Design a protein around this nucleic acid. Structure first.
Lengths: 66, 124, 186, 147, 53
RNA sequence: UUACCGAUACCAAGCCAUAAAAAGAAGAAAAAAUUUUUUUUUAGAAUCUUUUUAUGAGUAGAAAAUCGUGGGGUUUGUGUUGAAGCGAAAUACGUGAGUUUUCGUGGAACAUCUCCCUAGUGCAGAUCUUGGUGGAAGUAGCAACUAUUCAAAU
RNA sequence: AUUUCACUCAUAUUAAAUAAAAUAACUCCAAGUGGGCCAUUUUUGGUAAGCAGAACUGGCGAUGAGGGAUGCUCCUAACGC
RNA sequence: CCUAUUAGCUGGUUAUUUUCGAAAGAUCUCUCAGGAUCGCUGGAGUUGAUUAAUAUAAUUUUACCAGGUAGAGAUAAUGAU
RNA sequence: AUUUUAAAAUUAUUUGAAUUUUUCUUCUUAUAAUUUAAGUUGUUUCUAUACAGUACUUUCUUAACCCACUCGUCUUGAAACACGGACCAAGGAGUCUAGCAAAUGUGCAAGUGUAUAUGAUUCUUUAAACAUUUUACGCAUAAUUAAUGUAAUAUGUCCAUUGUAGAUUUGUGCCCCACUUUGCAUACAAUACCGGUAAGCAA
RNA sequence: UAAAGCUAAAUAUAUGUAGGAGACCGAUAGCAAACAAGUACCGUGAGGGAAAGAUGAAAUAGUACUCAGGAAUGAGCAAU
């Protein structure tokens, strides 16, 4: 029995019935494997700034908590 | 045609009959929704056993009340206590499985209660 | 006809009634929804909505997390829609004022020994109907195991879905498409 | 509870809720899991990737009774004992509890958790972990072997 | 099989109507055992049936 | 070029249902007789009550509210002054499955819709099966083996 | 490049217009479906076909109402009473 | 008797009303009358709106992009002629 | 029965003024009613002075103008010159079990279930209910690697990892918005830490 | 500490029999069979295998008597 080998009819209407879906567009994009030896430095940067901020936080907390 | 009587406004009469219940004895007059494929009634052809729908329902402000402007209520043996207050709103009908003695006492009580009865002359 | 999406009938999503057929809770929601309708405070509206949620979305909240989250301000009362579970992983507890639906005898004894008091929603309504000095909390909704099978299909690239398996031996779903040696991986 | 079934709502519907054009046929795809690697392979490859193939050496008669070892993290240790004894132990700076976890029915002690600073505890278990031992000895506690 | 379900593992492929046997008689068998052991000890002149282990 | 007729489309109004919306957990009115009697009501059920707007098509397909059937606990009745059923029917109710009634026949049981539990539970069909009855029809047909007739008895 | 501070960039119509734009977004469970066809326009093979095969769109199927005498697809127009 | 064997195939598959409401593509298939799969649909539930905004739009405009179809050619290439 | 009220207009007074220059000219100060306000109210008859009728409401049968192709089915396409159906009454088909998952409701909750089984002046109904001396097991609390096995910050402190938003919250300008305070849940990330495999070192 | 042997209980019963029960079926149902059932009947045989319950309180109330017809049966004023 001969069978229709292809069609693309009604496909666009089916697509637009639910509306063309958009990606969620989140804010941050992961750095799992992007250009290392730069984020390698950046992680140490973040660790250092966090360490300074948190040690100052603990110093203030102690000098206010006696 | 819609029938208008006093305040009760009825939109339809002629209780609907099943499609093809004319030329087929085995099909009883009780209505059903024919499923079919090319079953005419589902297609709603011009003028052929039109089917019931929600739109024919009467107004709930007057829906269940009887031409007596009064809802009907069944009674069996002595259950007239809940009828004393609403005698202007509920009419009473004797249940068909009531003997002559009990029906006589019920009719006696109801007549002096001043509440109408539908089948007053039942089995007498 | 008209050119209207969904033929011009507004459709919401959510519970329209409490399927929970429990007289005390039915009475309680009759109270809070009335409070929300009369007042203009979002607190009552939110708590009335939250008393309608299914059993899987009023989750237990542990004493440790509750105390940790009140550690910032000590004078307020917590309101949690679900029940609060006692945690044996905690050592000591300090003066906590809570309001939940159900409890656990161990948690009740622990909190009474701590010196707080278990406020039920009736007491909450009688005392603080405007939501004053009350902070609203809820336990982890999605941490339940059935969510581990959700998300991307297990077998999707970079998917983290637990697959349904009879056990976790060395012959149950560990060979093909999960290690580079046997065909591809993930 | 039979009238609650879905079928009791489709008595007058010809197809009984199982389709008209497709029709309802006995075992359409094939009996059981028959579609492996021939025509149902997309479902297996999408939901149970590692189902096929065998990996690993062979344990002949495992006898699971040998390597049975329930696990307890190091933080739950205080929660094991009653809270009043917890209060008295916390109060006194001269007495420390001894928890022979074999009595409760536990064998190994694992290092997950956060103990209470400056309080020694004696622990007796068939096995220990290095991090658990480090945590225990960091607060004056002692790990005691038992068998 | 249909999408995201566990792989079926039913060991019913052979005849099993031939071997199904439920136990309605649990409680009455318990009562019968009670009566039998009570009679056994009663007939023994009061000496306890149990033995030291 | 005007005038016209012409839709289950359009407009205005009424009613139904769905969805949304605004809002809600305790007091005397009128009429008729003649100040006093009579006459009708005097309402508060949240999966509810009042009100507003919009919309209203559907096979395969899904969900909700529903209406019935054989039983079962539970409440409360009917039954020799005749129940169950059945035939005809109803100024009868619903929108509709159906319910409820009157008359006749009948001669011993019947329902629960107060809430619920359960199921061998709802039919037009499957060259469905069993049992019965049609038209076709007082028609085809009652044809081989040569052939019977009269009088009487019974 | 990051963090914390400065300062402040129409926001009173809203960094163009217009929007019965939140009837959205997401997650879960599941049935049917998986032979199509006609129409204006474009177009492949064949002389052509109510043929075989594609393309953007609309219908039919899944759908009746008025008209084309009549018609599964044409025109008007989609249906509570 | 095994056995009510198996059958991707034919026929059938019983009460109402309301609400929502399709596909006949695409990948693989000892697959082409079937099936799994997403795509289309319903039900459920959650976060955000209820503040004529912001996300959002089969929309247009302002700016800025990319193409080589019709058309035009034979003196601009190639091939003709 | 606490918007059939307010005003809105009209009449008849009064108030000051005005202007298009006055009998529907306008703007209110104060008064009493009208309704064009604030969804149709009144008048006269008849039914009719009767207890079933020729009237009145309704069922049925006949006719009349208009319309209407045998249903069910597979099918792109059914009324078909596609197939089953002479007729009637009764019976007649998504059920049951094991296992899993999801949704919902309920109890309990870091525990849960009391299994086989045990005791009882329970022993028509009772083949059900009741009850279970200080680790029985399943499922869960911790994962991971073929595997010997190994096993979640780390003792500065009963703080409990860090961001961007984000519900609430305490207050300043008992009901909005902008300012600091807490930051649920979650979403997108970042960090550490455990097993595994790499790589460097390696007693 | 094999190549010899014995033994009650705890356990199973779609057989036969004898008791007792039921949210089971109610005469096309329920076992094939509620009754004269593994009977009538079919096949030379292995074998196959049905249909058929209800007067009435009491038939110790089962249709007496008259007329008409051969009798069936019918009618009565006759009769349960």
């Amino acid at each position: 029995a001969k069978s229709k080998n292809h069609t693309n009819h009604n496909q666009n209407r089916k697509a637009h019935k639910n509306g063309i879906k958009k990606p969620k567009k989140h804010k941050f994009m992961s750095r799992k494997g992007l250009d290392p030896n730069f984020f390698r430095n950046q992680k140490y940067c973040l660790k250092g700034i966090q360490k300074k901020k948190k040690e100052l936080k603990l110093k203030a907390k102690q000098e206010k908590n006696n | 045609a819609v029938k208008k009587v006093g305040k009760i406004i009825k939109k339809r009469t002629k209780k609907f009959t099943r499609f093809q219940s004319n030329r087929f004895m085995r099909v009883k007059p009780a209505w059903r929704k024919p499923r079919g494929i090319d079953c005419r009634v589902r297609r709603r052809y011009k003028g052929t056993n039109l089917m019931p729908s929600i739109g024919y329902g009467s107004n709930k402000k007057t829906k269940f009340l009887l031409p007596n402007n009064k809802y009907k209520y069944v009674v069996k043996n002595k259950e007239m206590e809940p009828l004393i207050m609403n005698h202007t709103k509920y009419c009473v009908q004797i249940a068909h499985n009531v003997s002559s003695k009990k029906r006589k006492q019920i009719i006696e009580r109801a007549k002096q209660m001043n509440v109408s009865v539908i089948n007053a002359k039942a089995r007498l | 006809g008209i050119a209207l999406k969904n033929v011009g009938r507004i459709k919401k999503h959510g519970r329209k009634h409490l399927v929970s057929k429990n007289p005390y809770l039915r009475l309680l929601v009759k109270l809070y929804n009335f409070l929300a309708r009369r007042t203009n405070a979002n607190f009552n509206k939110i708590i009335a909505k939250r008393l309608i949620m299914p059993k899987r979305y009023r989750p237990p909240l542990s004493l440790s997390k509750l105390q940790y989250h009140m550690a910032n301000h000590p004078n307020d009362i917590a309101v949690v829609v679900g029940s609060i579970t006692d945690d044996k992983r905690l050592f000591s507890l300090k003066q906590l004022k809570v309001c939940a639906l159900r409890f656990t005898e161990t948690a009740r004894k622990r909190i009474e020994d701590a010196g707080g008091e278990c406020l039920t929603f009736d007491q909450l309504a009688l005392k603080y109907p405007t939501g004053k000095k009350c902070v609203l909390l809820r336990g982890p909704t999605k941490a339940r195991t059935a969510e581990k099978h959700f998300g991307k299909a297990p077998g999707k690239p970079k998917s983290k879905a637990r697959p349904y398996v009879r056990s976790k031996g060395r012959k149950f779903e560990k060979a093909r498409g999960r290690r580079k040696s046997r065909a591809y991986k993930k | 509870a039979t009238r609650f079934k879905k079928n009791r709502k489709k008595r007058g519907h010809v197809s009984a809720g199982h389709g008209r054009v497709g029709k309802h046929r006995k075992h359409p795809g094939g009996r059981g899991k028959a579609g492996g690697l021939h025509h149902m392979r997309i479902n297996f490859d999408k939901y149970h990737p590692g189902y096929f193939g065998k990996v690993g050496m062979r344990h002949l008669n495992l006898l699971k009774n040998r390597t049975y070892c329930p696990t307890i993290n190091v933080d739950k240790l205080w929660g094991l004992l009653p809270e009043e004894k917890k209060k008295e132990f916390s109060e006194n700076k001269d007495i420390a509890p001894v928890i022979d976890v074999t009595r409760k029915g536990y064998f190994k002690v694992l290092g997950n958790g956060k103990l209470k600073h400056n309080q020694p505890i004696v622990v007796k278990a068939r096995y220990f972990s290095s991090v658990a031992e480090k945590k225990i000895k960091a607060v004056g506690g002692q790990c005691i072997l038992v068998a | 099989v249909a999408h995201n379900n566990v792989l079926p593992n039913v060991h019913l492929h052979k005849w099993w109507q031939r071997h199904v046997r439920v136990n309605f008689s649990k409680n009455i068998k318990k009562k019968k055992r009670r009566l039998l052991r009570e009679k056994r000890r009663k007939a023994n002149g009061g000496t306890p049936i149990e033995k030291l282990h």
